[PDB]
Design a protein around this ligand. Structure first.
Ligand SMILES: Cn1ncnc2c(=O)n(C)c(=O)nc1-2
Ligand SMILES: [Mn+2]
Length: 222
């Protein structure tokens, strides 16, 4: 399964627009009324203006070819200081057998480039903005982890209920797509920001559609 559409909010719509227009190219970013969309391979993200008094941010990982990590890292570093953790500007996660690259955007989103060494294809050609494959990860920060895992399982997603941990982060998915299901509070790696509940909507490849309210409740829309 893949993310076809992702709806996120932002308190820096104008700055966000310029940032991504400069990063992805005018041919991948469409400005709309009080919102704009960006194209990331087979995935699309619409950023909508956030409600006053709030400054939403999320953790978004973008898939890139197994052999494009170094190039992706260099490309990403041209748009912002690369984030570090343990004084390292990149990380290797053995569970996903992937290398990841991080940068913060104007609204404080943790933008990540993830290169899956075996779960992503090898593209014998130069990396470029046009080479972003799709959304590989998105955080589902909920006020009730067990309830979300349940409804997600009901939505027919790969879920091991007896393995879900309410107080921690839980990887839900397979192949090149994982939902980072967890509670608010914990600091995000490569970031000063701690997990906080913010609304969002998501439409998957299989027609499944779900949203997270401002309360943090996960609810299957479709
Ligand atoms: C546990 N874990 N595994 C993989 N990737 C991450 C990650 O990107 N971030 C931001 C995070 O807080 N935790 C992670
Ligand atoms: Mn990640």
């Amino acid at each position: 399964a893949s993310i076809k559409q992702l709806t996120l909010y932002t308190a820096e719509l104008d700055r966000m627009l310029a940032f991504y227009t400069n990063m992805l190219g005018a041919q991948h970013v469409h400005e709309q009324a009080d919102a704009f969309t960006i194209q990331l391979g087979v995935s699309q993200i619409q950023f909508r203006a956030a409600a006053d008094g709030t400054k939403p941010f999320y953790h978004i990982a973008i898939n890139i070819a197994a052999n494009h990590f170094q190039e992706g890292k260099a490309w990403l570093s041209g748009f912002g200081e690369l984030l570090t953790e343990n004084d390292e500007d990149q990380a290797y996660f053995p569970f996903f057998n992937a290398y990841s690259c991080y940068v913060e955007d104007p609204s404080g989103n943790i933008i990540e480039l993830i290169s899956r060494q075996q779960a992503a294809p090898v593209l014998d050609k130069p990396f470029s903005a046009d080479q972003l494959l799709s959304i590989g990860e998105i955080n589902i920060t909920t006020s009730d982890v067990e309830q979300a895992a349940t409804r997600l399982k009901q939505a027919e997603l790969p879920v091991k209920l007896d393995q879900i941990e309410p107080a921690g982060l839980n990887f839900i998915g397979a192949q090149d797509l994982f939902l980072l299901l967890g509670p608010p509070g914990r600091r995000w790696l490569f970031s000063e920001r701690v997990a906080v509940i913010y609304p969002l909507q998501m439409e998957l490849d299989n027609g499944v559609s779900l949203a997270i309210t401002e309360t943090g409740e996960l609810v299957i829309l479709e």
